[PDB]
Amino acid sequence: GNNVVVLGTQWGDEGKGKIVDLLTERAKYVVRYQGGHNAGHTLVINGEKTVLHLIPSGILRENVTSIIGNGVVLSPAALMKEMKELEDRGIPVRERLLLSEACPLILDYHVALDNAREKARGAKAIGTTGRGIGPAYEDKVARRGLRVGDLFDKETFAEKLKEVMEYHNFQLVNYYKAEAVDYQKVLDDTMAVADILTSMVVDVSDLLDQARQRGDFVMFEGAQGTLLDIDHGTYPYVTSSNTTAGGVATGSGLGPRYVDYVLGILKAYSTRVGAGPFPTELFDETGEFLCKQGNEFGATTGRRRRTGWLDTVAVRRAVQLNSLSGFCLTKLDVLDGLKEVKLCVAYRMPDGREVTTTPLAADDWKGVEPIYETMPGWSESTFGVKDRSGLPQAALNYIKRIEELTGVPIDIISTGPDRTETMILRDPFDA
Amino acid sequence: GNNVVVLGTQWGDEGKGKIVDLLTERAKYVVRYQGGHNAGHTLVINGEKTVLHLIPSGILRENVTSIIGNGVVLSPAALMKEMKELEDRGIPVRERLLLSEACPLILDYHVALDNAREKARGAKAIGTTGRGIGPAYEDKVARRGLRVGDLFDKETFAEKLKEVMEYHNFQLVNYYKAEAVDYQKVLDDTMAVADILTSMVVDVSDLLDQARQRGDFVMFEGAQGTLLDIDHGTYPYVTSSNTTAGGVATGSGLGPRYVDYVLGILKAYSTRVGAGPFPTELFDETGEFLCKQGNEFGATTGRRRRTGWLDTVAVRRAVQLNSLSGFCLTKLDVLDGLKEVKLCVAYRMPDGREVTTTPLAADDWKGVEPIYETMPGWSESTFGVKDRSGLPQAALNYIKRIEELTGVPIDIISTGPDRTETMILRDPFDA
Ligand SMILES: O=C(O)[C@@H](CCCN1C(=O)N[C@@]2(O[C@H](COP(=O)(O)O)[C@@H](O)[C@H]2O)C1=O)N(O)CO
Ligand SMILES: O=C(O)[C@@H](CCCN1C(=O)N[C@@]2(O[C@H](COP(=O)(O)O)[C@@H](O)[C@H]2O)C1=O)N(O)CO
Ligand SMILES: Nc1nc2c(ncn2[C@@H]2O[C@H](COP(=O)(O)OP(=O)(O)O)[C@@H](O)[C@H]2O)c(=O)[nH]1
Ligand SMILES: Nc1nc2c(ncn2[C@@H]2O[C@H](COP(=O)(O)OP(=O)(O)O)[C@@H](O)[C@H]2O)c(=O)[nH]1
Numbered sequence: 001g002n003n004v005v006v007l008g009t010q011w012g013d014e015g016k017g018k019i020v021d022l023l024t025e026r027a028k029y030v031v032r033y034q035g036g037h038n039a040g041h042t043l044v045i046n047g048e049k050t051v052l053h054l055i056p057s058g059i060l061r062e063n064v065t066s067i068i069g070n071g072v073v074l075s076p077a078a079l080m081k082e083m084k085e086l087e088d089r090g091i092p093v094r095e096r097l098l099l100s101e102a103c104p105l106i107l108d109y110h111v112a113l114d115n116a117r118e119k120a121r122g123a124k125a126i127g128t129t130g131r132g133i134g135p136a137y138e139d140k141v142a143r144r145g146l147r148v149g150d151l152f153d154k155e156t157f158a159e160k161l162k163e164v165m166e167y168h169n170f171q172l173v174n175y176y177k178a179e180a181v182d183y184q185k186v187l188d189d190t191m192a193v194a195d196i197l198t199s200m201v202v203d204v205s206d207l208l209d210q211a212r213q214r215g216d217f218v219m220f221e222g223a224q225g226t227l228l229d230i231d232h233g234t235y236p237y238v239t240s241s242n243t244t245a246g247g248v249a250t251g252s253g254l255g256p257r258y259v260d261y262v263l264g265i266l267k268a269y270s271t272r273v274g275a276g277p278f279p280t281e282l283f284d285e286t287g288e289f290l291c292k293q294g295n296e297f298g299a300t301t302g303r304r305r306r307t308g309w310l311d312t313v314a315v316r317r318a319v320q321l322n323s324l325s326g327f328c329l330t331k332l333d334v335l336d337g338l339k340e341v342k343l344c345v346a347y348r349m350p351d352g353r354e355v356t357t358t359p360l361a362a363d364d365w366k367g368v369e370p371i372y373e374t375m376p377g378w379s380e381s382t383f384g385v386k387d388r389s390g391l392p393q394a395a396l397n398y399i400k401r402i403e404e405l406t407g408v409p410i411d412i413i414s415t416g417p418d419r420t421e422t423m424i425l426r427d428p429f430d431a
Numbered sequence: 432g433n434n435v436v437v438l439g440t441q442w443g444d445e446g447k448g449k450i451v452d453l454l455t456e457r458a459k460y461v462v463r464y465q466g467g468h469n470a471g472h473t474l475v476i477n478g479e480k481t482v483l484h485l486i487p488s489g490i491l492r493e494n495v496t497s498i499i500g501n502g503v504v505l506s507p508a509a510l511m512k513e514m515k516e517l518e519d520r521g522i523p524v525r526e527r528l529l530l531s532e533a534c535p536l537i538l539d540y541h542v543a544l545d546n547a548r549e550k551a552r553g554a555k556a557i558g559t560t561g562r563g564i565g566p567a568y569e570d571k572v573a574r575r576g577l578r579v580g581d582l583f584d585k586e587t588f589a590e591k592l593k594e595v596m597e598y599h600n601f602q603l604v605n606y607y608k609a610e611a612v613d614y615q616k617v618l619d620d621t622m623a624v625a626d627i628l629t630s631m632v633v634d635v636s637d638l639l640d641q642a643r644q645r646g647d648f649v650m651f652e653g654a655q656g657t658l659l660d661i662d663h664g665t666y667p668y669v670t671s672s673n674t675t676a677g678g679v680a681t682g683s684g685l686g687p688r689y690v691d692y693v694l695g696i697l698k699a700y701s702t703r704v705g706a707g708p709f710p711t712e713l714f715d716e717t718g719e720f721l722c723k724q725g726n727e728f729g730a731t732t733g734r735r736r737r738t739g740w741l742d743t744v745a746v747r748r749a750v751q752l753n754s755l756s757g758f759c760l761t762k763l764d765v766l767d768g769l770k771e772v773k774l775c776v777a778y779r780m781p782d783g784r785e786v787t788t789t790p791l792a793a794d795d796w797k798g799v800e801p802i803y804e805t806m807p808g809w810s811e812s813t814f815g816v817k818d819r820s821g822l823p824q825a826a827l828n829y830i831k832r833i834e835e836l837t838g839v840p841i842d843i844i845s846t847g848p849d850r851t852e853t854m855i856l857r858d859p860f861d862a
């Protein structure tokens with residue numbers, strides 16, 4: 001397929017960054033369509049590690065033009081910092097990065113509001129990444145937020161920013177009783193880069209329609225995971241954007257009927273960082289093993305990620321919401337050495353019923369217990385294996401089982417962090 | 432196609448309600464996926480006029496199950512009032528209406544906030560429908576809003592509502608200096624209907640996945656229009672939800688790859704109610720004619736709708752954003768008697784350039800001038816005509832021209848408000 005979508009089927013950090021970079025070899029465009037700099041996508045090329053947050057994962061390839069779609073909430077400060085670091089490493093960012101004038105801006109007050117609301121929550125804290133993502137999306141919906149296109153007229157931008165910060169400071173000071181954000185600093189910091197950002201502006205939706213008609217290859221890079229979806233995730237312990245396949249159209253302008261293949265990134269086990277329901281969560285020795293062996297620490301906040309067994313029930317919800325075409329199984333190599341591996345095949349509800357569908361809101365998850373299916377592990381090392389013939393039978397039965405429970409094939413299997421430690425059984429672009 | 436989407440290609444009120452009702456004869460399900468009671472869809476069956484707002488337009492057919500998807504922001508009070516009026520007219524609503532537990536709730540304070548923000552805007556007022564739609568979507572994104580699923584546990588709902596209204600009253604009273612909303616009235620009013628609403632709850636996304644596998648016919652009914660889209664419309668003079676095709680997936684849970692045919696509702700001329708850029712707007716005799724002859728008054732607010740010539744440039748943007756499969760031209764009959772009709776074929780930018788694409792944000796529209804293409808009108812009456820052979824050549828050349836400029840065929844032509852005053856050249860379900 002020409003238009004391929006790569007997204008997380010779980011709670012994020014399934015290894016989307018790696019897959020995007022790997023598959024962009026054949027793409028002309030790579031587009032980010034939701035989220036902001038709370039995303040942390042790690043790429044490892046020949047041992048070199050790059051961690052992108054706002055900039056699309058195809059930025060290291062000179063043959064691809066990276067595009068930050070309108071769905072993304074842009075932090076001018078976050079962008080600059082990343083652009084610089086990359087430019088210092090021989091990546092001519094400005095030469096290959098384009099962005100939407102419709103992207104909402106994340107400013108200093110958004111971060112101030114983020115930390116404030118979180119402290120006001122107390123024990124009910126979401127455990128956000130503190131990047132002001134929520135407040136930015138909120139200003140957008142309320143129709144008072146500032147967008148990239150506003151930077152085109154400096155005087156009116158100053159007047160608009162004037163109004164918005166008046167409102168935001170009143171609540172930060174009077175209600176949340178925190179520090180006011182200085183209007184002049186924000187105004188100065190923004191204008192200092194206003195021209196850099198605006199020089200990269202392009203009509204994304206029209207461009208994507210052009211690419212489509214020519215039949216160019218375009219890859220959509222998702223941020224976060226399905227269960228963090230603002231509508232369908234474990235509300236209110238979710239992110240403020242639609243992390244599901246529908247976010248592709250709203251966040252880039254591409255018509256829904258043009259999405260040809262949706263690739264779901266599936267980790268061999270499960271992780272979640274931040275508060276919220278997590279049925280298969282392990283609090284024992286095996287949990288520590290997955291964390292250590294998988295080096296599960298926040299690519300953005302450095303927070304230790306919560307680990308657990310793969311949840312087939314939750315994944316099936318992901319298959320359905322995104323109309324998945326196939327999966328890419330990652331971190332299979334981390335499971336090496338375990339005597340047994342478990343797959344949650346159903347949920348035991350607090351009322352005794354055994355269900356195979358997931359609860360919606362976070363509150364409806366309280367009391368849910370996973371119903372496992374234990375399988376034999378493998379002693380053989382799968383790390384770096386680049387062909388099925390290198391995987392132990394136990395590992396193969398494990399792949400097959402997931403396919404059986406889900407009904408979706410595993411087209412790609414990743415056995416290590418490097419771009420090459422992978423095995424493509426089927427290329428989505430050819431599917 | 433089994434899964435058909437019906438949406439407005441302009442600024443709403445293109446006559447979506449009529450088309451949904453007409454086409455639901457063959458559908459098992461009809462789903463609303465965005466907006467709330469700001470929508471006003473008029474149906475006229477054998478002269479009988481029904482105006483729905485929150486309830487799906489397939490509610491008059493006993494063979495269809497209406498579903499209010501998670502994207503919709505639900506006003507418990509608005510629903511009850513509509514359910515009652517319909518039940519009094521022999522429509523067993525409760526027997527055929529289902530809804531999502533994920534739908535955010537529109538409460539009294541949301542309406543209070545709506546009117547307040549609008550007055551604070553002054554001359555920069557959006558001209559909202561005052562139904563609290565914006566504030567409801569804002570609470571959702573901020574992850575502090577209450578959803579239908581919250582009504583399942585009355586005690587915790589009271590505690591949650593307690594927190595949210597504390598926050599909302601502080602700003603309404605202290606900042607906006609308006610009246611506080613009484614917590615007890617809202618709590619009482621809500622609980623009085625809490626059980627009615629919860630009895631209608633269904634897992635929408637799972638159900639739609641079931642319908643899909645069986646191959647049932649499902650129709651998605653859009654609210655508002657493309658140019659009112661929160662991301663891609665004339666921001667900030669937009670509605671707070673995604674009115675484009677991508678909203679179907681995020682607002683119902685159906686995977687993007689399952690949308691088979693997107694039908695764009697296209698009015699013969701243009702209307703817009705409320706503030707915002709409108710290039711082809713007429714302020715002369717012909718404007719008054721279109722308003723009078725088309726009886727252009729708000730189906731929800733009673734506001735006189737602004738009229739103008741059909742804007743081909745803006746419509747082309749709609750074709751692209753929604754991946755339209757075909758159009759349904761409505762109110763052709765209103766153009767009867769005009770000596771000449773005009774089609775805006777391109778825009779004259781304030782800098783002298785002639786463009787064929789539309790500006791994004793509302794500010795980038797200031798100064799834009801329409802470039803017309805004049806065509807001869809027709810004296811013949813097309814009202815009620817149910818076959819192409821009843822349309823005067825001039826009317827036929829007009830249909831053809833729109834098809835030529837757009838590149839999308841006109842599969843349905845509506846020549847009057849009644850369900851039968853229509854001509855289906857092609858049924859989307861068979862396409
Ligand atoms: O916080 C980190 O360091 C994680 C972020 C994982 C994905 N992820 C987010 O980007 N945000 C998260 O979603 C929730 C809402 O926070 P926010 O509004 O900042 O996105 C939080 O649980 C937050 O942890 C969330 O789970 N990194 O491993 C991402 O590379
Ligand atoms: O206000 C009315 O009476 C119109 C509503 C037309 C569609 N429409 C909306 O539902 N809202 C509108 O979108 C903008 C945002 O308002 P709101 O947040 O209430 O949706 C306003 O211009 C408002 O008029 C808008 O244009 N009716 O003809 C709809 O049946
Ligand atoms: N062991 C192992 N690590 C992997 C594999 N694929 C990716 N990773 C690493 O797993 C982590 C994925 O989390 P993150 O970087 O947040 O990925 P993203 O946010 O989903 O793109 C990164 O540190 C990667 O280097 C794999 O197949 N095996
Ligand atoms: N004259 C005429 N009126 C029509 C036609 N189709 C629909 N209408 C009327 O046009 C109006 C459409 O606006 P509205 O009710 O807001 O429709 P919706 O919001 O798009 O579903 C209604 O009053 C309909 O009865 C048509 O073909 N001809």
Ligand SMILES: [Mg+2]
Nearest residue numbers: 013040041299
């Ligand atoms: Mg990450």
Ligand SMILES: [Mg+2]
Nearest residue numbers: 444471472730
């Ligand atoms: Mg209407």
